[PDB]
Amino acid sequence: MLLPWLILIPFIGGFLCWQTERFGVKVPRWIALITMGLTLALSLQLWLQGGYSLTQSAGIPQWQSEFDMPWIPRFGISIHLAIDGLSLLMVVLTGLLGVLAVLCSWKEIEKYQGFFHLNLMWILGGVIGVFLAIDMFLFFFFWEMMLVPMYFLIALWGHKASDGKTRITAATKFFIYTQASGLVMLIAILALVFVHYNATGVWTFNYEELLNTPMSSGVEYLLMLGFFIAFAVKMPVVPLHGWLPDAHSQAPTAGSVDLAGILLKTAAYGLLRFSLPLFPNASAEFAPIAMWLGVIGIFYGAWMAFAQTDIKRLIAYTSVSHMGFVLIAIYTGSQLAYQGAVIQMIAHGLSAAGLFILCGQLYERIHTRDMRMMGGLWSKMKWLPALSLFFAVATLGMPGTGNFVGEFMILFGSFQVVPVITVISTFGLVFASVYSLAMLHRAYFGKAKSQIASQELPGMSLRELFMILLLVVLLVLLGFYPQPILDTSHSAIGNIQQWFVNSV
Amino acid sequence: MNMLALTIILPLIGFVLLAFSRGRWSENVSAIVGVGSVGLAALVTAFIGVDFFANGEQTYSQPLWTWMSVGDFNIGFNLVLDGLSLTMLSVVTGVGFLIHMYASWYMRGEEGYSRFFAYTNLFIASMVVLVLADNLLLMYLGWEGVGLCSYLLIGFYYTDPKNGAAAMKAFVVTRVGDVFLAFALFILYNELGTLNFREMVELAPAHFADGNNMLMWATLMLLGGAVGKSAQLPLQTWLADAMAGPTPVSALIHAATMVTAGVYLIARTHGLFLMTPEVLHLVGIVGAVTLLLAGFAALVQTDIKRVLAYSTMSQIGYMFLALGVQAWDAAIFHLMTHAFFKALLFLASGSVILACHHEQNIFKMGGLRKSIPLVYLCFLVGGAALSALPLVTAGFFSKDEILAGAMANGHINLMVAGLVGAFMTSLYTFRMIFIVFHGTHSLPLIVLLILSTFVGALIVPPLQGVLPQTTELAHGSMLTLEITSGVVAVVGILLAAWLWLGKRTLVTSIANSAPGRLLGTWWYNAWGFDWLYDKVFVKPFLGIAWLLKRDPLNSMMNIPAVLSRFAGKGLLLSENGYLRWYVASMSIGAVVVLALLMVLR
Ligand SMILES: CCCCCCCCCCCCCCCCCC(=O)OC[C@H](COP(=O)(O)OCCN)OC(=O)CCCCCCCCCCCCCCCCC
Ligand SMILES: CCCCCCCCCCCCCCCCCC(=O)OC[C@H](COP(=O)(O)OCCN)OC(=O)CCCCCCCCCCCCCCCCC
Ligand SMILES: CCCCCCCCCCCCCCCCCC(=O)OC[C@H](COP(=O)(O)OCCN)OC(=O)CCCCCCCCCCCCCCCCC
Ligand SMILES: CCCCCCCCCCCCCCCCCC(=O)OC[C@H](COP(=O)(O)OCCN)OC(=O)CCCCCCCCCCCCCCCCC
Ligand SMILES: CCCCCCCCCCCCCCCCCC(=O)OC[C@H](COP(=O)(O)OCCN)OC(=O)CCCCCCCCCCCCCCCCC
Ligand SMILES: CCCCCCCCCCCCCCCCCC(=O)OC[C@H](COP(=O)(O)OCCN)OC(=O)CCCCCCCCCCCCCCCCC
Ligand SMILES: CCCCCCCCCCCCCCCCCCCC
C-alpha cells in the first residue's frame, strides 16, 4: 500500500519542484530534498517493518508487500507492484542516491532549475518503478520511462564545456541504445504473453502467472535472448557498452545525474527477477556465453579504464568491469554468488557515486578533465585527494570496503560452479588494481603538469564533505558488517536460486 | 588476556586520528599520538604474553563478531592467540614501536609527518590483523591491508614519480601474489567448507582420503601467495625497487611486517603442507634458490639500500628453506632475530643517509669509521649478526638451527645451499661495510644493538604445542655443523677483508674483465627478472591498452549508424523533385507489383 506512494512521491515532488520555482530560484532544490528524504524514509520504514531477516524462502511468488490496481483490463494489464528483500535493497539504495543527487546539485541555482529537479525526480521515480513493478508491461513502461528525462538532462543541462553538439550526440546514442533494447524486450514480453494465451486462453501480463509457461526450447531461448539484450545494454555488457562513457562524459558536471540515472543497476535486478525465473532452461543453456561475456567485460573495461585520459570515462569503464563480475555471478547456480552479486551492486553504487561526486568537485576546482593537465594535487587540496584515494582503494577491491565482500563472495560461489572463469576474473582484480593506481598516479601524485595544477585550490564545503564522508562510512560498514544486507536479501535470493536450479 | 582487540584498535585509533588531523597538529602531538598508539599496543602485547605464560600456554580465542554468513559459508571475525601468534605479535609490536620512536626523531621537519604516522599505524593494525586472524579470510583482510599500507608508505615522497612507480610495482606484484592466495582460499573452501585453520587441518585428512590433487593445488596457491608477500621467487622483483621510501618504512617492511607474512602463512598452514610433501619440498627449494640469487645480487650493488634489500631477500629465503625442511621453530627463531638485526641495519643506514647527503654511491663515501663511531658500531653489530658470527650474535644460532634442521631431515642439497649462502652473506655484508666505512646514543638503536647479540638468542619463542618439533640431530654431527658454519663465516669475513679493504686491485681486475662485467651487469639487475617481467607482462599490457585506446567494440557497434546514414543518403537520390521521374517511379512500382502477383499467384 506504500509502494504506489514510493513511486508517486518522486513524481509529485518533481511537479512541485517545477511549480514552486516562481516563489524563488533557491526553492526547488529544497522541495527536491524533502521529497527524496520522504522517499528514503518510507523505504527505511518498509525495511524496519518488513522483518526481512526472519523471513524464510518459500518460492516465487513471495512478496513482503503487494499492490494491485487494473490499468488496461483489455490486455490484463495492471499497476501491480510488489516488494521483497532484493527490491527493498535496491529501493533504499536509489532513495539514498537520490538524496545525494539533490545534495550534489546544491548551490547550482539558475533559471529552469525546477525543470532540472523535475527531470531528476522523474528519473528516480522510474527507477523505483522498475524495482517495484511485477507485471511485465508496467516493468517495461518504467524501463523506458527514465530515458526521456535522462536524455533531456544529458542534452540540455550537460557538460557546459562541450560543443553543444557532442552532448546531443551522447544523449541520442544513449537513448537509441536503451530504447531499441527495450523494444526487443517488448517483443519478447508480447510473444511470451501470446504463448501463455495459446496455452490457457486468458490475457495476463502478470509475472506470477507467466511463470511455468509451457514452451519449447527454441522459443524460450529466443524470449530469453530478447530479455538479455535489453538487460545487456543497460548493465552494460560488451559490446553494448558504448553509450556509457559518452553519456557519463557529457552528463551534467555535478555528477548528480550519474547517481540518479546512469549508475544504478536495474539491469542486474532485471536479470535476477525476470530472466532466471521466467526462462530457467534457456538461462541454463545461455550461461557459458553470458559468463564469457562477463569475463571479456571485466578485462575490456579494465583495459579501457587504463587507457583513458579522462577521469569520468575511467570511472565508467570501472563500472563496465564490475558489472562483468555481476554478470558472471548471476548465471551461476550459487546462492553465495547471488548474495555476493547483491553486495557488489550496492557497494559499486556507493563507490562509483563517491568517485563521480569527487570528480565533479575536482572539475569545479580545476576546470579541466585531462589527467595530463594535472599532477601533485595532494599538495594543493585539503580534503579531496585523500577521499579520492579512499574511493580508488574501494573500487580496487580492498577488504574493509563492501566491494571486496561482493567480489569475493561472487568468486567463491563461481569457483564452486565454474573454476576457470573464476580464475580469470581474479586476474581481473589484478587489472582493477592496475587502473586504480594509474588514476591515482596520474591525478593526485607527482609534479604539476600545468599552471592550474600548481595553484592552491579551495577546500570542500561542509555539505559535499559530509555527503562524501557518509559514503565513506557506509562503504566501510558494508565491508566490515555486511550481515544485515545479506539477511535482507536472503529469502529473495533463495527463492530465485531454488527456482533456477530445480527447473533444470 | 582478552585484549587482542585492543592491540588492533589502538593503531586503528591512531591512524584515524592522524589522518583526520591532516597536518593541523604540531609535530610533538602527532608524534606522541602515533608512537603512543604503537607503544600502547606493545604494552598490551606484553601484558597478553604475561597472561599467556601465566596459564599453561593454552590457545585463546576472542570472537568479535561474525563477518559473513551465507548458508554453509560462515566466515567469522575471530582472533586467536597461540605461541606462533604471540611470537609474531610481540615481534611486530615491539619492533614497530622501536621504529616508530626512531621515525619520531627522524621525520622532524618533513612534510606529511602525521600522514606518515597514520600510514604506519594502519600498517601495524593490518599486520596485527594478519597474525591474529583465526580464519583465512580475515588473514586475507590483513594481507591486503599490509599491501595497501606498503603502497602508501613506499611512495611517501609522491612528488618524485620514481617513488610512485616503485610503489605501484610493489602493489601490483603483491596483488598477483594475493590472487594466488585467493585461489588457495577458493579451493580450500570448495573442498572443506571452512576457512578456519584448526577446522581445515581437522577436516582435510578425512576429505582427501581418495584424491589429494586439490589439496596440492591449495597448498601450491598458498605458497604462491607467500612468495608474493615475502618477495621470493618468482615474485621478488618489487623488493629492490621498494627502496624509494624512507628508511623507517624500509625497516618496517623488511623486518617487522611485510616480508615476514609469507613465513607466517606457511607456518600457520603447516598442517596442510605436511599432507602435501612435494609442495613443502618446493617451498624449501624456492627458499634455497631465492637466497642464492639474492646473495649473488647483493654482491654487486652500489647502494646500501639495495644491499640490505637483497640481504632481506636471502634471509627470507633462509626462513623458507627452514620451512621446507620441516624446521619450523628454526624458521620463527630466525624470523625474530632477523627482525631485530635487520631493523638495526636499516635504521643505521638511515642515520648514514641523514649524516651524509644526496644518497651517495658506496664508493663515494669512505673512511666513515671516525666521523660517526656509534653508527659504525651499529653497522658492525648488524653485519656480524647478518653474517652469523659465532657465539656473539643471535643470527648465528638462528642459522645454526636452520641448517641443523636441514641436516636432520636428510636435505643435503638445501644444507650446502645454505652454507654457500652464509659464506656469500658474510662476503657481501662486509664488502659493503669495508667499502663504506673504510678508506647520539638513541634508545631504539641501543635496544636493537643489545637484541642483535646473543641476548636476542636468549629469547625463545613458545612454539611448543603449535608447531611440531624438529627431529634432533646427533651431538657429534651437530657439533661439526657448528664448526663448519663458524669457519665458513670466518673465511667469508677474511676474504671480504682481503678483497675490499686496501688497494682493491683484484676486485677492480675482476670487475673490469669481460666475464666479470657480464656477470656484474647480470647480477646488478637481479638476474634479469625485472627485464623479463617487463617484456612479458608490462609491454603487452601497454601495447593492448594503446591498441584499444579508441574503443573498437564501440566502433563495430556504431557501424549500423554509418550504414543507416549511407542508405538514407542513397535513398534521398530518388527525391530529385522531377515530376516525370515520379510518374516513372509509379509505373515501375506498378510493373513490380503486377509481376510479383503473377509470379507468386
Ligand atoms: C539497418 C541495418 C542494421 C539493423 C538491422 C540488423 C539486423 C537486425 C536483426 C537481427 C536478428 C535476426 C533474427 C534473429 C532471430 C532468428 C530466429 C530463428 O532463426 O529462429 C529459428 C528457430 C526457431 O525455433 P523453433 O525451431 O521454432 O523451436 C521449436 C523447436 N526447436 O530458433 C531456434 O531454434 C533458436 C535459435 C537461437 C539463436 C538465434 C538468434 C541469434 C541471435 C544473435 C544475436 C544475439 C547474440 C547473443 C547476445 C549477444 C550480447 C547481447
Ligand atoms: C582495519 C584494520 C586493518 C585491516 C586492513 C584494512 C585495509 C583497508 C583500510 C582502508 C582505509 C583507507 C585507506 C586509504 C585512504 C587513506 C586516506 C589518507 O591518506 O588519509 C590521510 C589524509 C591526511 O593526509 P595529509 O597529507 O596530512 O592531509 C591531506 C592534505 N593536507 O587524511 C585526510 O585528508 C582526511 C581523512 C581522509 C579519509 C581517511 C580514511 C577514511 C576511511 C577510514 C575511516 C572511515 C570513517 C570511520 C568510521 C568507519 C565506520 C564506523
Ligand atoms: C579489522 C580490525 C579489527 C576489528 C575492529 C575494527 C573494525 C572496523 C571498525 C569500523 C566498522 C565496525 C563494523 C562492525 C561493528 C561491530 C559489529 C556488530 O555489532 O556485531 C554484532 C556483535 C554482537 O555479538 P554476536 O551475537 O556475536 O553477533 C555476531 C554478529 N553476527 O557485536 C559485538 O560482538 C561487538 C564486539 C566489539 C566490536 C568493537 C569494534 C570497535 C571498532 C573501533 C574502530 C575505530 C576505528 C574505525 C575505523 C577503522 C578503519 C576503517
Ligand atoms: C612468467 C612466469 C612467472 C609469472 C609470475 C607472476 C607475474 C608477475 C608479474 C610481475 C611484473 C608486474 C610489473 C608491474 C609494474 C607496475 C608499475 C609500472 O611499471 O607502472 C608503469 C605504468 C604506469 O602507468 P601510467 O599512469 O600510464 O604511467 C605514468 C608515467 N609512466 O603502469 C603499467 O605499465 C601497468 C602495468 C600492468 C601490468 C599487468 C600485469 C598482469 C600480471 C598477470 C599475471 C599472470 C600470472 C599467471 C600467468 C599464467 C601462468 C600459467
Ligand atoms: C614456484 C613458487 C610459487 C609460484 C606460484 C604458484 C604456481 C602457479 C602456477 C600456475 C599459475 C597460476 C594459475 C593457477 C590456476 C589454478 C587452477 C585451479 O585451482 O584449478 C582447480 C580446478 C578444479 O576443477 P575440478 O574440481 O578438478 O573439476 C573436475 C571435476 N572433478 O581445476 C580445473 O578445473 C582444471 C583447470 C583449471 C584452470 C587452469 C587455467 C586457468 C586460467 C589461467 C589464466 C592465467 C592468466 C590470466 C590472464 C588474463 C588476461 C591477461
Ligand atoms: C661446494 C661449493 C663451495 C663453494 C664454491 C664457490 C661458490 C661461489 C662463490 C662466489 C664468490 C667467490 C668470491 C670471489 C669473487 C666474488 C667477489 C669479488 O671479487 O667480486 C668482485 C666483483 C664485484 O665487486 P665490485 O664491488 O663490483 O668491485 C669493486 C669496484 N672496483 O665481482 C664481479 O664483478 C663478478 C665476480 C664473479 C666471480 C665468479 C663467480 C662464479 C659463479 C658464476 C655463476 C654463474 C651463474 C650460474 C651458472 C650459469 C650457467 C653457466
Ligand atoms: C609507551 C609505552 C611503550 C611500551 C614499550 C614496551 C616494549 C619495550 C620496547 C620494545 C622492545 C621490543 C622487544 C621485542 C621482543 C620480542 C620477543 C618475542 C618473544 C616471543
Q: How many helices (H) and strands (E) does chain A have?
A: 20, 2
Report the C-alpha gap between B148 and A480 in whole angstroms.
17
- Number of domains chain A is built from: 1
Report DSSP letters for A181-233, one per residue. Answer: HHHHHHHHHHHHHHHHHHHTS----BHHHHTT----HHHHHHHHHHHHHHHHH
Is the Cβ pair A434, B183 closer than 8 Å? no
Picking from B73, B159, B179, the nearest residue to A336 by CB comes out as B73
Would you state the cell numbers that stand for residue B352, as one nine-digit string?
A: 648514514
B289 contact A CB<8A: no
> Which of B323, B303, B360, B347 minimizes the C-alpha distance to B451?
B347
Residue A225: C-alpha distances to residues A181, A188, A274, A282, B5 (Å)? 11, 8, 12, 9, 52
Handedness of CA A338, A339, A343, A344 (dihedral sign): negative
User: Residue by residue, what is the 3-state secondary structure of B196-259?
Assistant: EHHHHHHHHHHHCCCCCHHHHHHHHHHHHHHHHHCCCCCCCHHHHHHHHCCHHHHHHHHHHCCC
Q: Which domain holds residue A2?
A: 1-504
CB B434 within 8 A of CB B496: yes
Cα–Cα distances in Å, from A113 out to A25, A29, A106, A120?
Answer: 7, 8, 10, 11
Query: Residue A370 forms beta bridges with which residues?
Result: A310
Q: Which three cell numbers stand for residue B151?
A: 603502497
Point out the ligand 5 atom lying closest to the alpha carbon of residue A431.
51
Helix axes B443-451, B373-386, angle to 10 degrees: 30
Q: Is the Cα torsion angle A472, A397, A350, A87 positive or negative in sign?
A: negative
C-alpha A322 to ligand 3 mean position (Å): 27
- Ligand 7 centroid–CA B153 distance in Å is 23
Residue type, B295: G
Residue A141 Cα to ligand 7 midpoint, Å, equals: 67
Those of residues 506-545 in B touching chain A at CB distance below 8 A are: 541, 544-545
Report yes or no: B393 and B453 within 8 Å, Cβ to Cβ.
yes
How many of the other CB atoms lie within 10 Å of CB of B560?
A: 11
Q: How far is CA A395 from the centre of its chain?
A: 15
Peptide bond into A239 cis (omega under 30): yes
In the block, cell 555481476 appears at: A326
Q: How far is CA B115 from the centre of its chain?
A: 22
Best mutation site among A404, A476, A478, A481 for ligand 2 pocket (most ligand atoms within 8 Å of CB): A476
Identify which of A121, A146, A130 has the alpha carbon closest to the alpha carbon of residue A13: A121
Residue of chain A whose alpha carbon sits nearest to that of B188: A412
Burial zone of B365 (CB within 10 Å; 0-12 exposed, 13-18 middle, 19+ buried):
middle
The three-state DSSP-derived secondary structure of A403-461 is HHHHHHHHHHHHHHHCHHHHHHHHHHHHHHHHHHHHHHHHHCCCCCCCCCCCCCCCCCC
Ligand 7 site residues (CB inside 6 A) read B 36, 39, 42-43, 46, 86-87, 90-91, 94, 97-98, 336, 447, 459, 461
Residues 57-116 of B with CB under 8 A from A: 65-71, 73, 77, 111
Q: Cell 513502461, residue?
A: A141
**DSSP assignments along B468-534, one per residue:** PPPPPPPHHHHHHHHHHHHHHHHHHHHHHHHHHSSS-HHHHHHHHSHHHHHHHHHHHTGGGHHHHHI
Buried b (16+ CB within 10 A) or exposed e, B286-311: bbbbbbbbbbbbbbbbebbbbbbbbb
- The C-alpha angle with vertex A182 and arms to A179 and A186, in degrees rounded to 5, equals 135
Report the distance separating Cα A71 and Cα A53, nearest Å: 34
CA distance A360 to chain B (A): 22
* Ligand at shortest distance from the CA of B225: 5
At residue A51's C-alpha, the angle toward residues A45 and A56, to 5°, is: 145
C-alpha span between B230 and B243 (Å, rounded): 15
CATH number reported for the structural domain that contains residue B541 in this entry: 1.20.5.2700
Q: Where are the alpha helices (DSSP H) in B325-369?
A: 328-355
3-class state of residue A159 by DSSP = coil
Q: Which residues pair with A66 in a beta bridge?
A: A82
The three-class DSSP label of residue B70 is strand
Report which of A235, A230, A484 is spatially closest to residue A348, judged by C-alpha positions.
A235
Q: How many residues does chain A have?
A: 504
Q: Torsion over CA of A347, A348, A349 and A355, rounded to 10 degrees?
A: 110
CA–CA dist A111, A104 (Å, integer): 18
Which residue, B150, B296, B274, is CA-closest to B212? B274
Resolution in units of Å: 2.7
Q: Atom 28 of ligand 3 has which residue's CA nearest to it? A: B65
**d(Cα A219, Cα A227) in Å, to the nearest integer?**
13
Distance of CA B273 to the CA centre of its chain: 21
**Alpha carbon distance A459, A441 (integer Å):** 21
Residues B549 and B555: their CA atoms lie apart, in Å, by 12
Residue B23 CA: distances (Å) to CA of A455, A460, B112: 19, 16, 7
Q: Which contiguous run of DSSP H or E holds residue A80?
A: strand A77-83
Distances (CA, A) of A159 to A124, A162, A174, A246: 21, 6, 15, 11
**Closest to B440 (Cα-Cα) out of B381, B376, B374:** B374
- CA–CA dist B373, B336 (Å, integer): 27
Pairing state between β A77-83 and A65-72 = antiparallel
Residue nearest to atom 19 of ligand 6 (CA): B507
Helix (H, G, I), strand (E, B) or coil at B303: coil
State whether A412 and B144 contact (CB < 8 Å): no
- Write out the residue range of the structural domain in which residue B584 sits: 533-599
What residue's CA is closest to ligand 4, atom 46?
B176
- CA B154 to CA B143: how far, in whole Å? 16
Q: Phi then psi for A83, rounded to 5 degrees? A: -130, 140
Distance (angstroms) between ligand 3 centre and the Cα of A493 equals 26
Tell how far the Cα of A222 is from the centroid of ligand 1, in angstroms.
Answer: 7
Using CB atoms within 10 Å of the CB of residue A125, give its burial: 0 to 12 exposed, 13 to 18 middle, 19+ buried: buried
Question: A97 with A347: CB under 8 angstroms?
Answer: no
DSSP3 helix / strand / coil % (chain A, rounded to 5): 70, 5, 25
Q: Is residue A61 reached through a cis peptide bond, with omega within 30 degrees of 0 on the bond before it? A: yes
Prior bond to A4 cis, omega within 30? no
Task: Count CB-CB contacts under 10 A for residue A65.
Answer: 18
Q: Cell numbers 551492486 label which residue?
A: A345
Q: Which residues pair with B196 in a beta bridge?
A: B135
> What are B62's strand-pairing partners?
B79
Q: Is the peptide bond before B560 cis (omega within 30 degrees of 0)?
A: no
Q: How far is A445 from chain B (nearest CA, A)?
A: 5
Task: Output the nine-digit C-alpha cell for B598.
Answer: 503473377
Interatomic CA distance for residues A337 and A328, integer angstroms: 9
Q: Which amino acid is at B229?
A: K
Q: Are B199 and B492 in contact (CB under 8 A)?
A: no
**Of B493, B474, B175, residue with least CA distance to A431:** B175
**Which residues lie below 8 Å from residue A295, measured CB to CB, with a gap of 6+?**
A324, A328, A421, A424, A425, A428
**What crossing angle do the helices spanning B304-324 and B412-436 adopt, rounded to 10°?**
160
C-alpha A305/C-alpha A318 separation (Å) is: 6
Of A27, A145, A103, nearest in space to A360 by CA: A103
Method by which the coordinates were obtained: cryo-EM
| φ/ψ of residue B196, rounded to 5 | -70, 140
Closest to B310 in 3D by CA, of B473, B424, B178, B443:
B424
Please give the Cα distance from B349 to B298 (Å, whole number).
16
For residue B81, list its beta bridge partners.
Answer: B60
* For residue A252, cis peptide bond before it (omega within 30 degrees of 0): no
A277 secondary structure, DSSP code: T
Q: What is the grid cell recorded at A485?
A: 544486507
Burial, A462: exposed, middle or buried (Cβ in 10 Å; 0-12, 13-18, 19+)? exposed
User: In a 10 Å sphere around its CB, with 0-12 CB exposed, 13-18 middle and 19+ buried, how is residue A430 labelled?
Assistant: middle
Q: How many CA atoms lie within 13 A of A280 on its CB side?
A: 18
State whether the beta carbon of B533 lies less than 6 angstroms from ligand 4.
yes
